Amino acid sequence: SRIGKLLGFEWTDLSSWRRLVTLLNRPTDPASLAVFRFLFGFLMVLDIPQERGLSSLDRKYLDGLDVCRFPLLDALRPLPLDWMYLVYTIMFLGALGMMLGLCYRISCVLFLLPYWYVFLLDKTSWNNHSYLYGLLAFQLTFMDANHYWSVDGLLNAHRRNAHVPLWNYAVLRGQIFIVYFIAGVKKLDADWVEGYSMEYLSRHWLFSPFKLLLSEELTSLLVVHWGGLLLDLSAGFLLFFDVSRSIGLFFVSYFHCMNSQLFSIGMFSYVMLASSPLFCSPEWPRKLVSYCPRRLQQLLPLKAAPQPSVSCVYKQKPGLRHQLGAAFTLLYLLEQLFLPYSHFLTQGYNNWTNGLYGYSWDMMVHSRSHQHVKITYRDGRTGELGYLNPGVFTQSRRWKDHADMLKQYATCLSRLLPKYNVTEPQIYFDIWVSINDRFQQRIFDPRVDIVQAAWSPFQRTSWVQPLLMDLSPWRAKLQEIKSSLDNHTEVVFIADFPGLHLENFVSEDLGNTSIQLLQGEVTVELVAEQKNQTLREGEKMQLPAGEYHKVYTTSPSPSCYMYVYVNTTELALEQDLAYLQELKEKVTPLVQTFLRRQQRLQEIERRRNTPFHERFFRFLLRKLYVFRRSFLMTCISLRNLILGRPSLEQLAQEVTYANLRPFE
Amino acid sequence: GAAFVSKQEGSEVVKDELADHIGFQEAYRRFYGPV
Numbered sequence: 001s002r003i004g005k006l007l008g009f010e011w012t013d014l015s016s017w018r019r020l021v022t023l024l025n026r027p028t029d030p031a032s033l034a035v036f037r038f039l040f041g042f043l044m045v046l047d048i049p050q051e052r053g054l055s056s057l058d059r060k061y062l063d064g065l066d067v068c069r070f071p072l073l074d075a076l077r078p079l080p081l082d083w084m085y086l087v088y089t090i091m092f093l094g095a096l097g098m099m100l101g102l103c104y105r106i107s108c109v110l111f112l113l114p115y116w117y118v119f120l121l122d123k124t125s126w127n128n129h130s131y132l133y134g135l136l137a138f139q140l141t142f143m144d145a146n147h148y149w150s151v152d153g154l155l156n157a158h159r160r161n162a163h164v165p166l167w168n169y170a171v172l173r174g175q176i177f178i179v180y181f182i183a184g185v186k187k188l189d190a191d192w193v194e195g196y197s198m199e200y201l202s203r204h205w206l207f208s209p210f211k212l213l214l215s216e217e218l219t220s221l222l223v224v225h226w227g228g229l230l231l232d233l234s235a236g237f238l239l240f241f242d243v244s245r246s247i248g249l250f251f252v253s254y255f256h257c258m259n260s261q262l263f264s265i266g267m268f269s270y271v272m273l274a275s276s277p278l279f280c281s282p283e284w285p286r287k288l289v290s291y292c293p294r295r296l297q298q299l300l301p302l303k304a305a306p307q308p309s310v311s312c313v314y315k316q317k318p319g320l321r322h323q324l325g326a327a328f329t330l331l332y333l334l335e336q337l338f339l340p341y342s343h344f345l346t347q348g349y350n351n352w353t354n355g356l357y358g359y360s361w362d363m364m365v366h367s368r369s370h371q372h373v374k375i376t377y378r379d380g381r382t383g384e385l386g387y388l389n390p391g392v393f394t395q396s397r398r399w400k401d402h403a404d405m406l407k408q409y410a411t412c413l414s415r416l417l418p419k420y421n422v423t424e425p426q427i428y429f430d431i432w433v434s435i436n437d438r439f440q441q442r443i444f445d446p447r448v449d450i451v452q453a454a455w456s457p458f459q460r461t462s463w464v465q466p467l468l469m470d471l472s473p474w475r476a477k478l479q480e481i482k483s484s485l486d487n488h489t490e491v492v493f494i495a496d497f498p499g500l501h502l503e504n505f506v507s508e509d510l511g512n513t514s515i516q517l518l519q520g521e522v523t524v525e526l527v528a529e530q531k532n533q534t535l536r537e538g539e540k541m542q543l544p545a546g547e548y549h550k551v552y553t554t555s556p557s558p559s560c561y562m563y564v565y566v567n568t569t570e571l572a573l574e575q576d577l578a579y580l581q582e583l584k585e586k587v588t589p590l591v592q593t594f595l596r597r598q599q600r601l602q603e604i605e606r607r608r609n610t611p612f613h614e615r616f617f618r619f620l621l622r623k624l625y626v627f628r629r630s631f632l633m634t635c636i637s638l639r640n641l642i643l644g645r646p647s648l649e650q651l652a653q654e655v656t657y658a659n660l661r662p663f664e
Numbered sequence: 665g666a667a668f669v670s671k672q673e674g675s676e677v678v679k680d681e682l683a684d685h686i687g688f689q690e691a692y693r694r695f696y697g698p699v
C-alpha cells in the first residue's frame with residue numbers, strides 16, 4: 001500500500017480498539033530504544049553535578065540560611081543539607097542504573113522521584129530541558145528499554161535481547177516531534193517573525209558563512225529567525241519519513257551543534273542529538289555492530305535476532321499490559337499537545353508572556369532587560385517607609401517577571417523581616433522591564449501591597465500591568481534614536497501609564513541629563529526646587545544632577561519619553577586617563593584605577609591567543625573539579641548520616657580538602 | 665544592615681553567584697568548619 005509504507009501502518013489498524021492495541025504493541029526491535037536509554041542515562045550522570053547543582057548544594061540548601069524559595073507547591077519544603085546529598089545520591093544511583101540497565105525499573109524510579117522533587121522545589125530553575133529530562137525519565141520508566149545492551153540481560157534471561165512494543169518508540173518519536181513542532185508554532189510570534197527575539201545572535205562567529213552571502217541584518221531575519229522557524233516547524237516532519245530523513249538528520253544535527261556552542265543550555269543539545277536516531281529504523285544499532293571488526297563484536301551487545309517477549313502482541317488477543325501501553329500513547333501525546341496551550345486555564349501564571357516558563361517550548365522567544373527594581377517596605381508599627389535591597393533573600397532574578405513568584409517573595413519577606421526589626425511590612429515592587437527591545441515599563445502595579453494582594457492560580461492577576469502592544473511600531477524609531485548618539489551618550493526609553501509617576505534620583509555622576517517627550521504629556525517635577533514643568537511632544541528638558549526629579553504622566557494615553565544622559569565623571573575619568581596614556585609614552589587613586597585596567601587589557605588579550613589545546617585542558621580541570629567536589633562533599637554528609645556528625649574542626653579538614661582544585 | 669538600602673541608591677533608575685547571601689559566611693561556618 002502507498003500509505004502503509006509511508007506512515008508505517010494502514011488505516012484499517014485504527015478501525016477498532018483491539019486493532020489499535022495490536023498496532024501499538026507490535027513486536028519492534030529493542031536496539032534503538034536501548035542506545036537512547038544509555039545515552040540519556042549517561043548524559044544524566046554528567047548533568048547531576050553540573051546543572052542539577054550537586055557541586056553547589058552547600059551554597060544553595062545550606063542550613064540556617066534566610067532564603068526566599070520558589071517551589072511550585074507551597075508545601076514543598078526542602079530537606080536538610082545532610083539529607084539533600086542523599087537525594088542527589090539516589091538520583092545519581094538512579095541515573096547510573098538507568099545508564100547500565102541494572103535493576104532498570106528500580107533505577108528509573110530512583111531517578112524519577114528525586115528529579116521531580118528537586119525540579120518542583122524551585123520554579124526559577126525551570127527551563128525547557130529540565131522539563132524534558134523529567135519527561136524522558138517519565139516515559140522510560142514504563143518503556144522496556146533494558147531489553148537490549150543491559151545488565152538485566154546478564155542477570156535475567158527473559159530480558160536479554162527481547163522485543164519491545166511499538167509504543168516505546170511512538171511515544172519517544174511523539175515526544176521529540178512535539179518538542180520540535182510546538183516550538184515552531186510558538187516561534188510564529190510577531191517578535192520572532194519580524195526578527196526582534198535573539199537579534200544579537202547573528203554577530204557570533206558561527207554565522208560567518210551566512211554573512212558571505214547576506215548582510216548582518218538579513219542574516220538575522222532569514223537564517224536565525226526564519227531558518228529557525230522553518231526548521232522547527234519541519235524537523236519532526238523530516239525525520240519521520242524515509243524519503244527525507246537523511247536530509248532531515250543533517251538539518252537537525254547542525255541545529256544542535258550550533259546551540260551547543262551558542263547557548264549554555266546544559267545537555268539539551270546532546271539529548272536532542274541522542275533522540276533524533278529514534279526516528280530511524282529500530283535495528284540501526286544491530287546494523288552497526290555487524291559492521292564492526294570481529295574481535296570488537298565480543299565486547300558489543302548481541303547481534304542475533306531478538307527473542308519473543310511478553311510485552312508484544314504477535315499475529316492473539318492483548319492482555320492488560322498491552323492495553324495500558326496503547327492507552328499511555330494516546331493520553332500522553334494528547335496531554336503534551338495541550339500544556340503549551342493550556343495557558344487559558346492557569347491564568348494566574350499568565351504575565352506579559354503566557355504561562356510559567358519551562359513547559360511551553362517557547363525557547364528564546366522572549367528576552368528581557370530590567371532597568372530598575374525598587375522594593376519599598378513599610379513598617380506596620382511606626383509607619384517608617386523604608387527601602388529594601390533589590391534582590392535580598394533570593395537566589396535568582398526570575399521573580400521580577402512572574403506574578404506568582406512575586407507573591408512568594410512578598411510573603412517570604414513578610415515573615416523574614418521581623419528578624420530585622422520590621423514587624424509587618426507593606427511591600428511595594430516597582431519593577432521596570434522591557435521585553436524584546438520595547439519601552440521600559442512597570443510590569444507590576446507599584447501601589448498595591450503585594451503581601452496582601454490577591455494572586456490565585458486560576459484567575460487573572462489584577463496587579464500585572466498590560467504590555468503596551470500599541471507602542472510596538474515605535475521600536476523602529478527607537479533604533480534610530482539609539483544610533484544617533486555618540487560613544488559617550490546613553491539613552492533609556494520609558495513608557496509610563498496614566499496616573500502614575502516615576503521618582504528618579506539622578507546621580508552626581510550624571511551631569512547633562514535630559515528628558516524628551518516622544519508621545520503624550522508628562523509634567524516633570526523638580527523636588528528640591530518645588531517647580532513643575534509640562535512637556536510637549538518632542539520638547540527637551542534639562543534635569544539637575546545629584547538631585548531628585550519626578551515625571552508625572554498626565555496624558556490619557558500611555559506617555560513615552562526618554563532619558564538622554566551622559567556620565568560626566570566617566571568622561572572626566574577617561575579624558576584624564578587619555579591624558580597620561582599619551583604622557584606615559586613620550587618618555588593618587590587615579591593611578592590605581594589606571595594600572596588595574598592595563599593589566600586587565602593584557603588579560604583580555606592573553607585570553608584570545610591562548611592555544612586550543614590549553615582551553616580544552618583547562619575545560620576538563622574546570623569540569624573534573626565539579627565532579628570531585630560533588631563526590632567528596634557527598635561523602636562528607638553521608639558520613640554525617642551513618643557515622644554521625646564529627647567535630648567542627650574536623651569538618652573544616654574535609655571541606656577545605658574537598659574544595660581543593662585537583663591539578664591547578 | 666546589608667538587607668536594606670537608602671533612598672539614594674534604591675531610587676536610582678538608570679544606575680554561579682549563590683554565596684553572596686546575607687547570613688552566608690556565618691551559616692557556612694556553622695554547618696561546616698572554619699573553612
Ligand SMILES: CC(C)=CCC/C(C)=C/CC/C(C)=C/CC/C(C)=C/C[C@]12O[C@@]1(C)C(=O)c1ccccc1C2=O
Binds near residue numbers: 223259272
Ligand atoms: C537560509 C535559511 C532559511 C536557512 C539556513 C540553515 C539553518 C538550519 C539555520 C538554523 C540556524 C540556528 C542555529 C538557529 C539557532 C536559533 C534558535 C532558533 C535557537 C533556539 C532553540 O534553543 C534551542 C537551540 C534548541 O536546542 C531547540 C531544541 C528543540 C526545539 C527548538 C529549539 C530552539 O528553538
Ligand SMILES: *[C@@H]1O[C@H](CO)[C@@H](O[C@@H]2O[C@H](CO)[C@@H](O)[C@H](O)[C@H]2NC(C)=O)[C@H](O)[C@H]1NC(C)=O
Binds near residue numbers: 525
Ligand atoms: C507637579 O504636578 C504633579 C501632577 O500634576 C503633582 O502631583 C500631584 O500631587 C498631589 C499631592 O501630592 C497628588 O494628590 C496627585 O495625585 C499628584 N498628581 C498625579 C498625577 O499623581 C505635583 O504635586 C506637582 N508639584 C508641584 C511642586 O506643584
Ligand SMILES: CC(C)CCC[C@@H](C)[C@H]1CC[C@H]2[C@@H]3CC=C4C[C@@H](O)CC[C@]4(C)[C@H]3CC[C@]12C
Binds near residue numbers: 114116
Ligand atoms: C514529591 C516527591 C516524593 C516526588 C514525587 C514525584 C511526582 C510529584 C512526580 C513524578 C513524575 C511526575 C510527572 C512526570 C510527567 C509529567 C508530564 C508533564 O507534562 C506534566 C507533569 C507530570 C504529570 C509530572 C507530575 C509530577 C510527577 C507525578
Ligand SMILES: *[C@@H]1O[C@H](CO)[C@@H](O)[C@H](O)[C@H]1NC(C)=O
Binds near residue numbers: 489512566
Ligand atoms: C548635553 O548632551 C547633548 C547630547 O548631544 C549635547 O548636545 C549638549 O550640548 C550637552 N550639553 C552640555 C552642556 O554639555
Ligand SMILES: *[C@@H]1O[C@H](CO)[C@@H](O)[C@H](O)[C@H]1NC(C)=O
Binds near residue numbers: 507509510567569570
Ligand atoms: C559613572 O562612571 C563612574 C566611573 O568612575 C561609575 O563609578 C559610576 O557608577 C557611573 N555612574 C552611573 C550612573 O553609571
